[PDB]
Structure formats: structure tokens, C-alpha cells
Amino acid sequence: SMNPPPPETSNPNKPKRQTNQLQYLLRVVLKTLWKHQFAWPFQQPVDAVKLNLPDYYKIIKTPMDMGTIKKRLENNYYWNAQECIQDFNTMFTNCYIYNKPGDDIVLMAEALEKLFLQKINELPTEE
Numbered sequence: 864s865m866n867p868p869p870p871e872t873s874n875p876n877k878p879k880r881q882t883n884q885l886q887y888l889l890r891v892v893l894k895t896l897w898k899h900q901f902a903w904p905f906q907q908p909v910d911a912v913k914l915n916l917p918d919y920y921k922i923i924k925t926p927m928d929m930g931t932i933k934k935r936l937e938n939n940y941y942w943n944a945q946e947c948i949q950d951f952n953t954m955f956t957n958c959y960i961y962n963k964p965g966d967d968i969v970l971m972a973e974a975l976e977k978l979f980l981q982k983i984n985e986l987p988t989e990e
């Protein structure tokens with residue numbers, strides 16, 4: 864069994880910025896989700912070998928996780944807040960696509976996503 868390479872977190876020729884919206888995404892959005900009791904399954908790429916999910920990366924072709932997002936934010940990988948918001952949404956959607964309603968992992972994602980939505984509802988206007 865084999866995992867894919869993780870998503871890119873470094874690319875020196877990708878344009879990047881540090882916007883006030885991106886600072887909010889790190890200091891408020893990521894920090895809130897990361898500390899949550901249900902964060903742990905989402906803090907690193909899905910290890911499809913250790914979890915014995917051999918079809919995971921057959922179904923999930925755009926993997927994302929908060930470990931990857933955390934590194935992207937800390938390394939100022941992004942140009943804009945929409946890029947980062949898309950990553951969070953890709954993470955949640957992958958969970959819903961792969962799993963079944965009412966599974967524990969789906970309940971965990973839902974809890975995290977509720978908080979994500981409440982925080983992004985107050986994303987600041989760009990300075």
C-alpha cells in the first residue's frame with residue numbers, strides 16, 4: 864500500500880502575499896479549528912496505509928488537511944484568502960465524499976465546518 868506525496872507547501876516561484884485576511888485565517892480560523900477536540904483526524908494527511916483505506920486516494924483526487932493548511936499559512940504560501948478558504952472547503956468536502964452520513968468522522972467534520980463558517984462570516988475587509 865502507498866500514500867501519494869502530500870500537497871505542496873513550498874514553491875518559491877509562486878507569488879505570495881501576507882494580507883490582513885490571511886492573517887485572520889491563521890490567527891482566528893486555523894487556531895480555532897486546530898485546538899478543537901475533533902481536530903486530530905484532520906491535522907495531517909490521511910495515511911491510507913495505516914488506516915487501511917486502500918481506495919481513499921482512488922476517490923479523493925484533491926487531498927487536503929489542516930496540517931497542510933497550517934504549513935501554507937505559516938510559510939505564506941497563499942496569494943489571497945480565497946485560496947485558503949478553498950483548501951478548508953476541499954478538506955470538508957473530501958470527508959463528505961468519502962464517508963457516510965452519521966459516521967463519526969462526518970460528525971467531526973461537521974463540527975469543525977460549523978466553526979469555520981462562523982469565523983469566515985467575519986473575515987475582515989481587505990486593508
Ligand SMILES: COc1cc(OC)c2c(=O)[nH]c(-c3cc(C)c(OCCO)c(C)c3)nc2c1
Nearest residue numbers: 903904905909914915916957958961962963968
Ligand atoms: C484517523 O484520521 C482519519 C481521518 C479521516 O479523514 C480526514 C478519515 C476518513 O475520512 N475516513 C475514515 C474511515 C474509517 C473506517 C474504518 C472506514 O471503513 C473502512 C472501510 O470498511 C471508512 C470507510 C472510513 N477514517 C478516517 C480517519
